[PDB]
């Protein structure tokens, strides 16, 4: 009997449950943050409290946890007892994978449902349905944090790295502004080839610069360009400054101006040529950002400006 079925009956009116006494919740004589539960919720949870207090490891209790979960999927106590019953009753865990698939489709932002799926995958040692299932959830919400966490967990645990850069490329074509996908790109590359390989780094910086030319005001591409070069220091790449200054007239943005200040910061901290000239250009860009191009971050750019004067003068 489904919880939403038109012929659903309360547990207190079910013949197969007549032997057990419901156990009411003890909220105290002067209750606080008291939820006026509906009859359906109160009935399920009074009977769940009864099977849990006596540790009844039965088939009826297993079916009851399904109803308790549908009423409040965040009740981690019910999820724990469901896993105890899955193992004690030797329940077919592939039937449980079908069930968890359906409830994650309904409540993809709940934590407990995703943790339950990982336990099932660990128990069965079978990740064969995971990448396709997660791609279906990401097809509905491409930035679901739990879905990306589950995807990273499956890929790391079972070594499923071979097709992920291709999947990343597909979602970047769909939405080049999806920051979760730019994160997945870094996750795949840093755990497979790494960024120390010059051919890989060159390919990544050339790809990112082409995405910046196409959509100049997309912050994720600018953040990815900075993140993969900041490790060794932006001043380590001398052609980068002039290549961004060449894109400045037609594809300008406060992201390009901020990246120029980031380059000048590292040049000053690494004993660059024309040190007096570099500091003045950096302070001028901090002023333009604080007073005009990026006033929401005026306190940040004023701090950077004072910081540069303090360190390099």
């Amino acid at each position: 009997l489904s919880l939403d079925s038109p012929t659903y009956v309360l547990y207190r009116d079910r013949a197969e449950w007549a032997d057990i006494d419901p156990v009411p919740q003890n909220d105290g004589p002067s209750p606080v943050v008291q939820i006026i539960y509906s009859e359906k919720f109160r009935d399920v949870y009074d009977y769940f409290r009864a099977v849990l207090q006596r540790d009844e490891r039965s088939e009826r209790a297993f079916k009851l946890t399904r109803d308790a979960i549908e009423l409040n999927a965040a009740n981690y106590t019910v999820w724990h007892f469901r896993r105890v019953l899955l193992r004690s009753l030797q329940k077919d865990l592939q039937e449980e994978m079908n069930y968890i698939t359906a409830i994650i489709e309904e409540q993809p932002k709940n934590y407990q449902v995703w943790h339950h799926r990982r336990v099932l995958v660990e128990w069965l040692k079978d990740p064969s349905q995971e990448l396709e299932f997660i791609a279906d959830i990401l097809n509905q919400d491409a930035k679901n944090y739990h879905a990306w966490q589950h995807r990273q967990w499956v890929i790391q645990e079972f070594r499923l790295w071979d097709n992920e850069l291709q999947y990343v490329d597909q979602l970047l074509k769909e939405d080049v502004r999806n920051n979760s996908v730019w994160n997945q790109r870094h996750f795949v590359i840093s755990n497979t080839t790494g960024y120390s390989d010059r051919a890989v780094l060159e390919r990544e910086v050339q790809y990112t610069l082409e995405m910046i030319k196409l959509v100049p005001h997309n912050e994720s591409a600018w953040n990815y360009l900075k993140g993969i070069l900041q490790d060794r220091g932006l001043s380590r790449y001398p052609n980068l400054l002039n290549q961004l200054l060449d894109l400045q007239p037609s594809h300008s943005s406060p992201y390009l101006i901020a990246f120029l200040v980031d380059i000048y910061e590292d040049m000053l901290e690494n004993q660059c040529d024309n040190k007096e000239d570099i500091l003045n250009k950096a302070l001028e860009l901090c002023e333009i950002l604080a007073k005009e191009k990026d006033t929401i971050r005026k306190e940040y750019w004023r701090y950077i400006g004072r910081s540069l004067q303090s360190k390099h003068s």
Binding site: V32, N75, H80, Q149, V176, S180, F187, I228, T295, R297
Partner: protein, 404 residues
Amino acid sequence: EPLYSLRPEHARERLQDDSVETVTSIEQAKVEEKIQEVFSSYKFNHLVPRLVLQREKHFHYLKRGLRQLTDAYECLDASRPWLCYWILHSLELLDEPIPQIVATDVCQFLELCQSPDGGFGGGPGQYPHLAPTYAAVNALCIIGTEEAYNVINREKLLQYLYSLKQPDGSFLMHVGGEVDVRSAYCAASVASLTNIITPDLFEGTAEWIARCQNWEGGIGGVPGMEAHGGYTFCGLAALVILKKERSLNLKSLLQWVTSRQMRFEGGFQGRCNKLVDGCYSFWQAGLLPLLHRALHAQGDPALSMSHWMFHQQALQEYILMCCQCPAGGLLDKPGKSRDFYHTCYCLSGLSIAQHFGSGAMLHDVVMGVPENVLQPTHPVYNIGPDKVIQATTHFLQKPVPGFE
């Protein structure tokens, strides 16, 4: 002209999609259109803007929720110590006193949520979990009576934290549960407030949190994950408690959080290229006082002596004009429903935006009517600074527990 969000030049901060439409730019433009209708409403109706925090409406909503809720809150039946914390904290921010009988009633309910083996569950008889444990201890410290402090079984709380500690430094959220940066913050928060930190309880924890800082500068829930404001708050606040902030690259973290403030809306987004949301007024803006304190400890001479490194005025205008429900309570953004979670964090973020403090320097920015000024909040614990000192002073008079 005094309101930054209403000036003519502010129109230039609207999204530039570069003539390339994706789901992200379409949803961002929909929100900016809705936010601009709110900003222009005073001009269209021909009224002087008057940013008023609806204290009495928020107060009625909170004092009622503190006692009883409809079946619409059934999804919060495993988060009842969170409801205690969100409501009591909003009431303390609004300078509303807790009657002694109500305070006693909360102490007794949180006693029913406490597990015989330590920690608190989401309700009476529920298994313990670090999230309601964090909320119950913060709620009991907001009450701050001898009765409230006495509720906490410190010996069993310490044993419980050890049962969740992992060899790699992380903590499980609950037994047979999972790890994330929130669990390290929950444990460090309750263990420091109650004085149960042993020499090896947080061994490796700072180093594990540092592994969660990624290429963006912010912190993810676990290593490899996208930078997220809530997890970044948890990460940095846990490191401030442990005095290990320098395990992070504080400059890439400073650049990441300052970038999360929306140039047009004034509020904060939780992740890069996502929508503005009132709750991140605390998770994201709360990071600037923590970063200011961390850099000040290193003797940074370039720090401001009057303001946080975020647009305090624009954040207050977003909260006051776009996040208040007319019937009371606060929200994510216009068109969304009110809840006690957003009431807590919109008001906590508003309080950080109003009060600056560093060393002997104090400076307030109260947008709108002077009555909008809230009581201060501690950026590490998100409870009143007075309540932090009272709780730490109380529990420092007890020894750190031994092992059974």
